[model samples]
Each structure stands twice: as C-alpha cells, then as structure tokens.
Target: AFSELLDQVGGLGRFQVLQTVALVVPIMWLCTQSMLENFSAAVPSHRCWVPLLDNSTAQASVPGALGPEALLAVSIPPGPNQGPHQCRRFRQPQWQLLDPNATATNWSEAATEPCVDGWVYDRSTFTSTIVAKWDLVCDSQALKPMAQSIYLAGILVGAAVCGPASDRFGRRLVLTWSYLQMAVSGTAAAFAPTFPVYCLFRFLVAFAVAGVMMNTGTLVMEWTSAQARPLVMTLNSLGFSFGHVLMAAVAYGVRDWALLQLVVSVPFFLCFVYSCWLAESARWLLITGRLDRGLRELQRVAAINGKRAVGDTLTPQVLLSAMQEELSVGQAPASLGTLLRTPGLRLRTCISTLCWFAFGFTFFGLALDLQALGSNIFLLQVLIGVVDIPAKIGTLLLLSRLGRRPTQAASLVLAGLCILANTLVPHEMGALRSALAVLGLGGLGAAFTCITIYSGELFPTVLRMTAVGLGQMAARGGAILGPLVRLLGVHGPWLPLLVYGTVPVLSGLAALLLPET
Candidate 1:
C-alpha cells in the first residue's frame, strides 16, 4: 500500500534524488571521522633524545664529525633486534659501541633508563599526529588503543540510543541533531588541547557518527521504492568507500592532525543546514499515526516531484486505509521486544545480529591495525579503498542475482578464508600478507553493503530503526572487541588472527539460517 502511495508521488524521482545527494555528503564525512585516528594518531619512527650527545661541546670533543646516527648509537643501547632503542637511553655514552667491528656484548648489563629527556620522532610521514602531539609513546602507548576503545563505546551507545529515539521522535529529528552534534564535536576534537580532552570529543564524534549512519540509512530506505532500494543503498555506501581514499589524500596534504580533523568535521555544519529541508519519511508519519503530517509530507514530495495533483487527492482517510495494519502495529510503539516476541522477526533479528558482529570484528580488526602491514600508510589506505570499488560493484550484482542470503554468506565466508590464510603465511611474506589483508577487507566491505540492504528489508516499518540500531550496536561491540582481541597476542602471535578469521566463518554459517528476502 505504501509502495502504491510512493508510485503516486513519483517514486524515486527528483525528491529522492535530492535527498540521497544531500545524505551522501555526510555519509562520506562520517566515514572519515570513523577512521580519522589512523592518520591523526599514527606513530612514527622515534628514538630517545639524548641532550649530551646533541650538544656542540660533545660534537667538538669527538675525534671526527659524528652524525646524528652515530651520536644516537653511542647514547642509546641497541634493542634486541640491534636497532637503537626507543624507550631507553644509556646513563653514560658507550662511545666504543659506535665502532662497527667492536665485539658484540650483552648491552643488557649497561646502566640504562627510560628516556630522561624526551623522544625525537621522524617527521617524514606525518608532520604531527596525536601520538606525536601528546607523546602517546612508551609508558603511555596503551592509551592510544584505550582512546579508540572509548570512541567505539560511544558508537555503541549512540546506536542504542538513536535507533529508539528516531523511532519515537522521527528520523529527520535525530539526523539533524546528529549533524549538529558532529559539526560541534568534531571541531572540538580538532582543537583539543590535551589527550583526555581529545578522547572525550572523539567519543562524542563517534556518537554522532553512529546517529548519522543509522538515521541516514533508515531515511533513505523509507523514501525510495523497493525496486530502486538496492541501487540507492549501494551508491550511498560507495560514498563511504570513496571517503577512505579521500581521507588518505586529505591526510597526506594536511599532515597536521588538528587541521585534518577540522577539515573532516566542519562540513557537517553545511549538512545540518541542508538536512533541515529534507522531508520527513511519509511512511514513517503514516505508520506512526501522524496522518495529517503524513499527507502533507507526501504532498510536498509530490509537489517537488511534479505529482502535486495526485498528491492533493491524498487525505488522512486515504493514508489510514493504506496503512491501517502498520499503523496499528505502530500505535503501541514498537520496542526491541516487538522484534523478538514474533517468531519470524525473532529469528531474523538474531541471525542479523550475529552477522553484524562478525562483520565488524573482522573488518575493523583488519583496518585498524594497518601499521603492521609494512606499507606506506597513505598508499595502503588508497589500495584498500580501491579494493572496495570492485567488491561493492560485485556485491550489488550478487545481491540482485544471487539473493541477499547467499551474497551475505559468501562474503563473510570468503573474508574468513582470506584472513585465515594470511595467518598461515610466514611473516617474511609481507607482500602476500598485505595482499590477503586487502582482499579480506574487501570481502568484509562487501558483506557490510549486503547487510545494510538486507537488514532494511528484513524488518517492518515500525521496528526498522530499532532493528538497524540493534545490528549497529552488535557491530560496534565487535569493533571494540576487535582491538581487545589483539591484546591476546601474548598467548600466541597467531591467536588474534585466528579468532578474527574463525568468528566470521561461524557467523557466515549463522547467516545461512536467515530467510532470504
């Protein structure tokens, strides 16, 4: 019935086109915010700064001109790998150690201390980053992961809150508020004076990001007709993939983290401005019993799409007749329990939840720790982004032809296989390992695209936001767990990769249990 109304109002016409275009801008910006820390907090090569070795008197006292490297060699003990130690400095310079032919001795017996001065970071890759800004190194290195964990926690909470709130209030309201929140919070993070303040603002940024994603998805789905839904959603998701590449370019140019943060955040203010003009989801209005507003919104869409005459024929009674069943379901106000109390809905919710969790767990695990891949960060970011282009296009084709369940299952299964295979490869095989990681990321990206459309199709109007939100919460939980899983490397170097690979495979099996839409 709603689809009938959509047709009358010129479904997927000028109105939807405008709305989607507006929505995609924020989607890309939000994508960058989610991954900003990769550039903003990147740790560069660093070594202990020795004041004595850096002094002119010390240089003059040396027999020959001692370069910086030679000075560092005498002032810092070699790490276990025979590189200058990052965390330790010799109490007294081991001048003899500078000789290449000097007999190797166990430097562990040398009197060394944690950096008494500070560290000098290589400024080649990044002129500045959060790691360099606050010196989140050595003893404080753990804080970097902790900060990102808090940010992911904010995303989880945002999903939990915004989904229900959008259901109760409306999608446009939550989306507008999210944009405003993003504009403010992102700017706040860029100018943050201290690490804790930066973390706090990052948490808020994550919160707004989650809100924007949940509401944007629901709004787009509600406005477009079924026939165009898959294509519209895929195009919007492509914005996120492009964002990864754009962010790398932006980060490369704006090497300073603060300025880069500012660049990504400030545009949301413009998004907030345009979002004010977006029509409320007429389907949402009709289902929620706002019959008069529903009729008006549809008429507005009809007017914009050049179907005003047909739209004027719409009235409260017409809407009531069209959506009586859904309106009745909406009357009681759908809760999470509404999704579970029904047997079919319950099964769909459970399976999608598991799939979302595994998707986030593996996707973020591969993405967030790219530093270990031994590639140029900017080039690597671009490469990963490029991988998604084909992956998403293929996903769109598969979803259209193979159906959602098979597409979802195959994506996750292939992702797991790629990741698991990488773990078996020797560390010496950097190219192979990096290639596997990029491929795994693409598979996860494809699964995400499939899941977005599949979840939207699975739930009814009243429960849609809640269902999507729940899935997002599960994914965010997985994202948080992704980093924590890395800490388990103390037990076995292979353990984290093993878990990352296996969970998706099991979840791919779980996805098979979902009914195809």
Candidate 2:
C-alpha cells in the first residue's frame, strides 16, 4: 500500500518540478492574454482636431499698444506678409504675432500679424490648431472596460463548465484543447473588423483561457507534495506576472493593436509542442483506476528526479487502500451531494467565491483602468509589471510561514486600505499622489496572489479543480462589475477610487469567515 501510494504520487519531489511547469505555462499565457487585451487598448494618445479659424483670415488690430507680454497673445493670418504677421482678435486687447523663421513655419508664419513695427505676440501666437488632450474620453473609454468585462464574463462561464470537463475527460486533454482555442480565438480577435467583433472574439479567448488557468493549476497541485504546494503556487503567480512583463515589452514594441495580437497568438502554437511531452496527472490516474499507466508515468518521473521505482508493478487495490488510510479517520469520499450539503465545505466555497470575486474585480479593474491613474500608459504598465515580482515573492514567503488564510486575509485588507488611501489623497499633491498610487497598485497585486493561493488550498483533492473554477467564476462576476462601476465613476475621478476601496474591504472581511486548510 505504501509503495502504491508512492507510485500514485510519483515520488512527491519529482512531481513538483513537472507540476510547476504545467501550472506556470498556462498562467503565464492567461496573464499575458489578459493584459494584452485590456491594458494595451486603454492607452491614451493625442487626438487631432480641426481648428475654427483658418490661416487665410484677415488680421484684426490690437486694442492698445502691445507690451512684451502682450506680444504672446497674437495670432498670425495667411499669405506672405513677408517679415512677420500679427493679429489681435476678440475684446481682450490680445495680439498674435508670427515669426516667418519660426521652427513651426506653417503655423508660425501664418501667425505673424503686422502689429505696430516692434510688437509681436510670441507665446500664444501660432496657428489656432490647438490639440486638447484629456486623460479620459468618457464616451470612448467604455470600450476597453466593456471588452474586458465581457472577456471575464466568458471566464466565468468557462470556469463553471471546464472543471467538470477536466474531471470527466482528464487534465491533459482539456488543457491542450483550451490552449488551442485560446490561440485561435485570440488571433481572430486581433483581426476583428469592428469593435463588436473584437469583443466577441475576446470573449471566446477568455473562455478557453479560464479552462487552461484552472486545469493547469489543478494538475500541478495534484502532482506536488503538501510541503511544496506553496512554493509551486507562488511560482505560478510569478509566472503570471512574468507574462505581464512580456506583454508590456511586446506592447511597447508593437503599439498597433492588430500586430500585437498576432505576435502574442504565435506563442500558443508552442504549447502544442509541450502537449506531446507532458503526461496526465498520476494522482488523477490512480483515482480513476488507471493504475498501471499511472505507475508507468510515475516511474518516468522517478527516473527524471534521479530515483528508481522499487516495485515492478503497481495495482489499483494497493493504491486505494493507501488512499483510504490517508483519509481523515473515517471521512469517506463524500458524494457530490455531501460536498454541497457539508457545512464546512459550503462555507469554504462561499468565502473562496467572495475572495475570488474581490480579486478579479480589484486586480483587473484597477489594472485596466490604469490610464485614469495619471501616468504614461506604457510606463505605468511596465511599473505595474515590475511591482508584481515583489508581491508574488512576498506571497510565497508569507503563505509558507503565516499559512494561507491569515496571509491572504492580511494582504486583502492591506490592499483595500491602500486603495482607500489613494482615494482620500488630494490630487494636487502630484508626485506624492503618484507614488501612493503605485503603492496601492502593489498592494492590489499582492492581494491577487493571495486569492489565487488561498482558493487552491481551500478545496480537497476530490473537488479541488472544480472549486477553483467555481470560485474564479465568482471572481469574473466581480470583474464584470468592476468595470461597470468604473464607468459610473467616470464623471468624478474619486468615484471609482471610492468603489475600489470599499468593495475590497467587504471582500477582505468576508474572507475572514472561511476555514483554513
């Protein structure tokens, strides 16, 4: 029985390495896909508008003799007035002047109005082609958030469905199919002719991505030892963050939306290469009674880990007996009904669901809305990506020492507080506000890692992946709401901040109610 358990678990240490890779690859893909679709599209750029005044208009005279400062207010008219032309329009006694030799010759030459010989409007005197740049386009701003919301909605649906499929069909099959779907759909989304089509394709990508995200983690967790789970999970978090960094780098280079999408989609094909090399979860195989095949895979893993399988063959009865011994005293493999009816399990489900919801809402909401945070969009993305490294590392360290529940709850609380602080701070503080915003974002990232780790830990082996999927589905609900709330807050900058801070606080508090594993 002991040897069978070893065969089932695949020599714990060996399974950890393979499991880590399985978990990390899909997470990296999901993280990169999320940012590529959400953050990159939200970047602000200059919008050119046509001016009311044309260069050919006649020049008007200044009300009073222009002063050195008065020369700044002049405008230049069209045609060759040779030296420099200046014009004063409106009742403010303003004069506009143009210098023919001005670096911006087209507008500057047209700005020259012949004021009394010595006077010219130096400062404001240019062609009236003023570019009004604003941080938020209330009307157009909804597109990015709306797209992300729909994508997350798809994630919700996929999570609910994929878990059962993975359990029924096996992890490797579902993972490969999901990855292929993500690749195809993501690529299609990139070339979508209209915004609506693009959004639809993004939703499809999200659906596949959710399946990959859940199943990959489940496979990894099943393969690893209890001791190595925390490290494996945190490394998965890091992999996701690394994907964000990759997206930032790719988006930085390929600013065009279509081009970037194509570039990102290309990597999905590589997942196929891994598919042929990777094996199904041995623990899963053991549970399903494919003991011989499970042992064969275990032996392979043992060899890789520099160990040899002691037994020549492993049997299902042997494996089952060992598993029965490991079960808590008399606790049976509760039927699906028991999982739902069980008080402890139900509480865990509800709490984990709320935490997932909070995580999805806060993480993607703030991240997608970064353009509203008053920084260079690309640089902000890069900074956000950079901060995640520490957050993930911290989660890894803290989860190991403090355990899952406390660490996760603390991180969520801290994240909520930081967001609240950001909301309360005066915007006039400029640099100080920016710094605090970064800190707040960092806290948010940390909270996200906590939720991912905590959700995985709360479920038992039987329902582990299913519970994760369900919890993530709830999180996607939050993702949908986060953007809508952000949209509502568009009128006042503080509105979204207020919502962001409040929701997470509630979520953190709710998290306190869940049982620790």
Candidate 3:
C-alpha cells in the first residue's frame, strides 16, 4: 500500500523538480534576509575624531591677536599630564578670547597662546562615500542586531507552535497563514517608526518566517519519495544560499537600508499569489482520515504532474475505501511522544539540534564579527558567500554518495578544525590568516549544508516536520547566543573561536552516534 502511494505520487524525479523549485524560494528568501538584516551593521560609518587635549600644556603668546590666521607656539607637555596640546605645537591666541565663551577655561588659555606645531586633523572615512552618506538620525547599528536576534527568538517560538498546528490543520493552511503573516509583518517591520518598534515587528516577521520554513519542508518531504527526498531537501537548503546571493546583489544594487528591507519583503506577495495553487498534504489527510480531501489533493497533484487518478473518481466513499485498503497493517499514528520514544530518534534529534545550534552560532557569529577578525567586512562577507556555492554543491554530492552521517561529520570536523586553527595563526601573518579564514568559510558553509540535509532525514514521515522545526528552533537559539559569544571574543579574540570550535568537534563526534535513516 505504501508502495502504491509512492507509485501514485509519481517517480522521485518529478517530485524532486517540483519540490526543489517550490521549497528553494522561501528558504532562499529567509536565509538571505537573515544575513543581510543581521550583518548590515558591520558596515562602518563616518567617525568624527575629537582631539583629546592635555590639561597641563604650557602655552606661549604670538604677536598676532590669535585671529584665524595667527599661529601661536605652545610647548609640548611630557609624561601622563600631556594632553591634546602635547600632540599640537600650534595654538590660536584668538581662542583665548573665545575661551570665556568656551566650555573649558583651558581652551581660553590655549587660545591666547597658539601652538606653532598643530597636528593635522585626521578622521576615519569609509571607502564608499556615496554608500556612507546615510541619515545619522536613525540608530541602525544598535537596533539591527537586537532586532534580528529578537526576530530569530520569535522564530523559535513560532516553530514550536506552528509545527503542531500544521500537523493538526494541514501544511497548506499553516503555509498560507504563515506567508500572509510574513508579508504583513515584514512590510510593517520595514516601515516601523522606531528601533524598538522595528524589533517588535521583526519578531512578528520571524514568527511567520518560521511557519513558512517549517511548512515548506513538510510539504516537500511528505509529497516526495525517499530517494528524491535528500535532493529536494538540499535544494531547500540551497534556497537560503541562493537568497544570500540574491541579497548580496540586492544590497549591492540598493544601498539604502530601508529600501533594501522593503525590496526583500516584496517576495512575500508572490507567496500570496501562489497560495491558490497550493494543495494540502495528502499524507496529512490520509493520517487524519480525511479521505475525500486527501483524494482530491492527490488528484490535483497527479493532474499537475500530467496524470489522472484511477479508481472510482475520488468520491468520499471510494477514496475512503481506497485509503483504508492502502493503510499499512498495524501502523500507528505518529505523535510527539512517540517520536521521542523511537530508538535513535531522540539521540538523532539532540545531535541534530546541537549541530544546528553550532552551525547557526559559528556561521553568523563569524560573519557578523568580521571586523574583529581583522579583515574588511564587505570583502569577507562577499568572499564567504561566494565560496558557499561550492560548499553547498559539495555537500549535496557527498551526502548523496556517502549518506548523511559521515558527510555531516566530515563537514563539522572541518569547520571545527578551521575555527580552532584560526586562533593559533600569528597576527603578523595576515596572508596566512586570510587563507585560513577562507578555509573556515568553506568548512562553515559545508557544515551548514550538511546539518540542513542531515536534520531533514533523521525523522519519519509522522514527525519530520516537528523535528526539523525543533532543529530550526535550536539554530535560532544558537543565533541569539552567537553574537553574544563574539562580543566576549572582543575581550579575548581567540576565546570565542576556541569555544566555537570545541562545540562543533563534540557535535560532529556526537553525530557519529546517530543511526542513519
């Protein structure tokens, strides 16, 4: 009977093509938006250099009355007491005239005696001057990271809630609602008046993002054959990578933050447009005894696949009879508790959860803290994103041939070693450090692909959606912690990398214990 359903669903190839395209879009959108929204803060802004003046510098008077043109010589103060005046040998005596109006009386003294040796003012400037010109009015730096993390935290909650809702209601129902939420909330987030308010709305956006992501995977996996499942799932993973590439292009094209956010949110409208064509999961219908609906959806899928459903034209009675005939003998309905009870499922879930967590942590953390890594942020991100394409393709190839566990383990091991190696490299060897960073990027990208595919495979049909949703939740949790860990790294650069590296090594080893599905 199960075999009959597989036959009816058509071959793996057909399912792969349809599901790959369907699933990749949303995943790409979410992943790219996640990267852009979170890391955009790394882009440096204009910084004004305010000279720190020495309080103890002795000043000499010049013949000119210290008008803008007159330069007065001042003695440089030595030792700790030497302040801003020590750096500058020139002073404007006219500044003394203005010192009465100045905030500091020392300025009046320094103004009376102009230093002959005045230090030239130096200010840090951004490389892209046009892109540098943004309203200093908004709190982009502080707000963006908080908003992104809060939104991801909301995703964690949404996954927990939406997975069961989809299981109970149907993938189509959950997906439609979730997509609508993403559209509305993402639009609202784009236009939020204040930083705090933006974060609040971003949380709502994350809520919807979680729902769509979970349901998309559920729908694809449920409708696909086992043989095609890995490919479909990895393509789902590719969606996020593709989103990164798209966002990079979009970011390059659109420099404004608000405009970029608005552009990213526009894709959700297409989700609404496609909602009408979506079919509810037939597997969900069959499990729930909603035979007529299941049969109708199955027919719709067959029709879309250019086939006709056989056997009594899918009436309620006929469909129910057919479904009953197709049921596996003594098969039990799946539940959350049953999922935990399954042999190796719990271990698999825990390991996958940790892997997801590590991947989220290191991937985003490293990306976000590029400046801390002593590299140009934009170049680092571009290089990392560009390198990810090969990593993703390699994971797909390796997992297809070698199976999930070994592939995931290898990638994780590579990432761990690379990260750990990053800490040992001498700061003087900049080229070596850059090369290792690329290696880390490759390993990190590979680990991401591996975990995404591995997690998708660790569960049965009954709990696949829930398991992946939970894994995503774990990943989001890691995302929240990742930046915080990096912040700690600022105090001790290698400390966070060491911790980041150790987690993955342990995770990869733990992954070895997971029974292959």
Candidate 4:
C-alpha cells in the first residue's frame, strides 16, 4: 500500500535524486574518516638517532668531514633486514665495523643500547604523523593499533545507541545531529594536544559516523521504492569507494597528519548545513501514528517530484488506510526487547547480525593489514576503493536477477573460498597472493551491499533503523576482531588466514537459512 503511494509520488523521481545526492556526497568522507589512521598515524621507517654522527656542526669541520652515511656506518649496527637497527645503536662507535669487507659476525660482538636520545624518521612520505608526534614506536608501538581498536569500539557503541535513538527520534533528527557532531568532533580531533585527547575526539567522531551511516541507510531505504533499492545502495557504495581514492590523493598532497585530518573533517560542517532540506521518512511518520504529519510529508515529496495533483489527493484517511496493518502492530516505541520478543523479528535479528559480523570481520581483516601486503600503501588504498566499484556493480545485477538470499550467501561463500585459497599460496608470490586477497575483499564488498539491502527489506518500517543498528553493532564487533585475530600469527604464520577464511564460509551457509525477500 505504501509502495503504491510512493509510485504515485514519483518514487525514483526528482525528490529522490536531490536527496540521494545530498546523502551520498557526505558518505564519501565516511570512508575517509574510518581509514584516517592509515595516513594520520602511519609509522614511517626509523632508526636510533646517533648524536655524535648526526651533529652537523661538529661533523662539518672535522678533518675528513666524513658524510653522515659514513658516520652512520660506524655508529649503528645493521638490523635483521640488513639496515641500521630501528630500536638500538652501538654503545660506542665501532669504527672497525665500517670496513668494506667486515661481516655481521664480527659486528655482533659490539654491545648495543636502546635509543637513549631519540629516533630519526624517514620523511619521504608523510612529514608528520601521530606515530612520530607521540613517539608511539619501540616500547610504545602497541598504542598505534590500540587507538584504532578504540575507534572501532566507539563505532560499536554508537550503533548500539543510535539504533534505538533513530527508532524513537526519527531518521532526520539523528542524521542531523550526527552531522553536527561529526563536524565538531572530527575537526576538534585535528587540534588535539595529546594522544589521549586525540583518541577521545576520534571516538566521538566514530560515534557520529556510525549514526550517519545508520540513519542514512534507513532514510534512503525508506524513501526508495523496493525495485530501485539495489541501485541506490550500489551508488552509495561507489561514493564510499571514491572517498578512499580521494583520501590517498589528499593525504599525498597534505603530508602533514593534522592538516590531513582537518581536510577530511571540515566538509561535514557544510554537509550539516545542507542536510536541513532533507525530508523526514513518511513511512516512519505513518507507522509511528503521525498520520496527518505523514500526509503532509508525502504531499511535500509529491510537490517536489511534480505530482502536486496526486499530492492533494492524499489525506489522513488514505495514509491510515495504506498503513493500517503496520499500525496494528504497536505505536509504542520499539526496543531491543521487541526484537527478541516478537517471533517474526527474532530470527531476522539473529541471522542478519551474523551475516553482518562475517562481512565486517573479513573486510577489515584484509583491509587493515595492508602494511603486510608489501605494496605502496597509497596505491593499495586507491585500488581497494576502485576494486569495490565492479564488485558492487555485479552485486546490484545479481540482486536484481537472483534475489537477496542467493546473492548474499554466494558472495560470502566465494569470499571465504578465495581467502582460504590465498592461505596456500606462498608468500613469495606477492602478485598472486595480493590478487587473491583483493578478490576476497571484493566478495566481502558484495556481501556488504547485499546484506544492507536484504536486511532493510526484511524488517518493517518501525523496526528498520533498529535492525540496521543491531547489524552495524555486530559488524563493528567483527571489525574489531579483524585486528585482534592477527594475534594468531604468533602460533603460525597461516593461523590468522585460516581463521579469517573459515568464518565467512560458516556464516555464508548460515545466511542460507534466511528466507528470500
């Protein structure tokens, strides 16, 4: 019934065009924010600082004026990779070690000490980063990953809170508030004076970002006709992918971490200003018993879409009649308890959560480990974004042709198999190994696109935001697990890959249990 009314109001017409453009532009930055640390906190190559060798004034006037390279050869011992040790340097200058034919066996006798003065970093890429700024290296290296984990945790909490808040407050309100929060929090994060302060503001930024993604999903899905839904989500995924490419370009040019942070965040203030024009979801209005208001909202959309004649025809009576079955359920605010207590919704919550978890786990697992992939980080970031384009485009086609369940399950299954296959490939085969990982990443991308569409279709209007919230919350858990699972590398080099490979297959089969929408 709502579908018919939507069709009459020009379901895929001018209003949706404006609304989608407004929503998707900011979504591009959403990817940039989530992946910000890749550039912002990047750990550049470094070695222990040798004071005597590095003091230019004293060395400049010395007899031979030996260059820093020659001085470094005597002062620092070669590390495991046959470079100067990053964390240690010679206790005393070992001039003999600089002999042209001197082997490492003779150099081993020289005592070493931890970097006492400081470390020098290669500034070829980034001029500054949190790693260099906070010196989160050597003994403090663990803090780098910890900051990301904290940010992911913030996203999880945001999902947990924003889901119910959207259900109670309406998508437009939450979205507006999220945009404001993002603008302020993300910008503030750039100027943070300390690492802890930086993490706190980033947590707030993550929280707001989660809200934007959740509410945007509900708002877009609720406004769009079912037939056009897949296209809309695919476009969003494309916009999101473009953010990655843009981030690389921006990061490359900016070079300074704080300035890069500011570049990605300041646009949300503009997004917040423009977002005011977006209409509230009429389906939310009707289901929540605001029939008169829903009528006005639909009429407004109709007017914008050049259906003012059809708009006038809509009345409170027509809206109530259209959504009678939905209102019969309950007008009281929906809660997490409702998800469990309502027999029809219970299984959906459980299944969707699992699928979201699987997708998030594998996607971030491969993505966050880019440093280990042994490629230029910026290029890999761009490729990761570009790669999602074809994958999601394929998902859009499969969704239209095959329907939801098959597309969802197949993407997950293929993703798992691709990952598992890569585990057998030797590390020396960098090209083949990276190709497999990117393929798996594509499959994960497809699964994410399908699951968002599938889950939105599964639940009713009132529970839509909550369900998305729950799924996002579950996904954040999986994202957090992505980094955590790497700990398995301590047991065996392949252990983490085995775990990353197995979960998706199990979840893919579990996805089959869901009914086709």
lDDT agreement of model 1 with the native:
0.81
Q: Candidate 1 at 307: error in angstroms?
A: 2.8
The residue-by-residue lDDT of candidate 2 on 1-517, one tens digit each, is 2344554445456546665665576676677788775444544322211121221222224354434332432433332334322222222222223342443343443322232222211122211111111122324545545666787788888977896788877999998998889889977876665667877888888889888888787877676666566667667777877777777677656545566677787688778557766777766776665777876776676666655544335455555667665443543444456567877577777777778888778777777776666555566667777887987777767877886777777778888877778767666775565666677778778877767666776676777766765776677788878777766663777888877888788888878777775
TM-score of 2: 0.72
Could you give candidate 3's per-residue lDDT for residues 96-181 as a string of tens digits? Answer: 42433543434323322332323232224322221233322123333334544676688778877996688788888888888788
Greater-TM-score candidate between 2 and 3: 3
Error of 3 at 502 (Å): 3.5
Alpha-carbon RMSD, candidate 1: 3.3
Each prediction's TM-score versus the true structure:
0.88, 0.72, 0.72, 0.86
Worst 10 residues of 2 by lDDT: 125-134
The whole-model lDDT of each prediction reads 0.81, 0.65, 0.64, 0.82
The total of clashing pairs for model 3 equals: 19
How many residue pairs in model 4 have overlapping backbones?
Answer: 0
Clashes of 2: 21
The best candidate in terms of TM-score: 1
